[PDB]
Nucleic acid binder design. Structure first.
Ligand SMILES: [Zn+2]
Length: 252
DNA sequence: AGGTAGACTCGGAC
DNA sequence: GTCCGAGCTAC
């Protein structure tokens, strides 16, 4: 799930779990548990806590309990569902939080790729994976000024910059390509080569792109097809270890 | 010093 | 065998 989908999960899951008390935690794929590293400690500490809130930072969900916060990343295919303990689990269910009311919060992931970290709430923001996470793209904390400052200080491409989680939170590959297209900027441009005007335009398109989605595609996955603005075939390359899609006419 | 690239994790489709 | 995408180690 991308940031807007995670925001949707946050919004929709919260009412379904708030006020419920954990009675058991069952773990079927221990590698998902990153902190405490021992899955038995992870399970033991959450028993008896009540779910109080659900927040989002970038693509991370932060489940707020009584004492602890559970920090969860779904990666590409991770999903949560709330359902009855009396019914069979869905395939690829790796972690289940059992509530005292006979319902469960279940985490599935065919790719077994997601991560879970539990810390005391007051610690979560200064420990991995939230430590160092950049500002929310839709927040005033993500500004053209901030973007420009990171851009001048690096020798990396503008695409590599936008993919950097310390620059801006949870801005996935798809939105990087779409935003760069909308801003008219080639993904392989050195970040420091962007003019002030280009930085401001890129900021504006990043906000618009991810903002509209939180509320269809110009280039991402469209290689070999006509640009929707100029008709030039979309091209695909690799930039910063990601599939990279762009119009060589609209973007400069 | 610390910015930067690589490796690592995973499974399903070409 | 690689392609895909997110987010500790060693130059
Ligand atoms: Zn075009």
């Amino acid at each position: 799930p991308q940031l807007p989908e995670v925001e949707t999960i946050r919004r929709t899951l919260l009412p379904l779990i708030v006020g419920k008390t954990i009675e058991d935690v069952r773990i079927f794929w221990p590698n998902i548990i990153r902190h405490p590293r021992d899955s038995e400690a992870f399970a033991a500490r959450m028993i008896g806590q009540t779910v109080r809130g659900l927040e989002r930072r970038g693509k991370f969900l932060k489940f707020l309990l009584d004492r602890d916060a559970l920090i969860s990343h779904l990666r590409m295919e991770g999903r949560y569902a709330v359902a009855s303990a009396l019914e069979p689990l869905e395939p690829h269910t790796h972690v289940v939080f059992c509530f005292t009311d006979g319902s469960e919060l279940r985490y599935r992931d065919v790719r077994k790729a997601g991560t879970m970290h539990v810390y005391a709430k007051e610690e979560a923001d200064r420990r991995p994976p939230l430590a160092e996470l950049g500002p929310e793209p839709l927040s005033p904390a993500f500004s053209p000024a901030v973007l420009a400052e990171r851009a001048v200080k690096t020798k990396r491409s503008v695409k590599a910059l936008l993919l950097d989680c310390t620059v801006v939170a949870g801005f996935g590959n798809i939105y990087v390509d779409e935003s760069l297209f909308r801003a008219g900027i080639l993904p392989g441009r050195p970040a420091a080569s962007l003019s002030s005007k280009e930085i401001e335009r890129l900021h504006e398109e990043m906000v618009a792109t991810i903002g509209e989605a939180v509320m269809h595609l110009y280039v991402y996955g469209r290689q070999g097809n006509p640009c929707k603005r100029c008709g030039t075939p979309i091209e695909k390359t690799v930039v910063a270890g990601r599939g990279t899609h762009y119009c060589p006419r609209c973007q400069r």
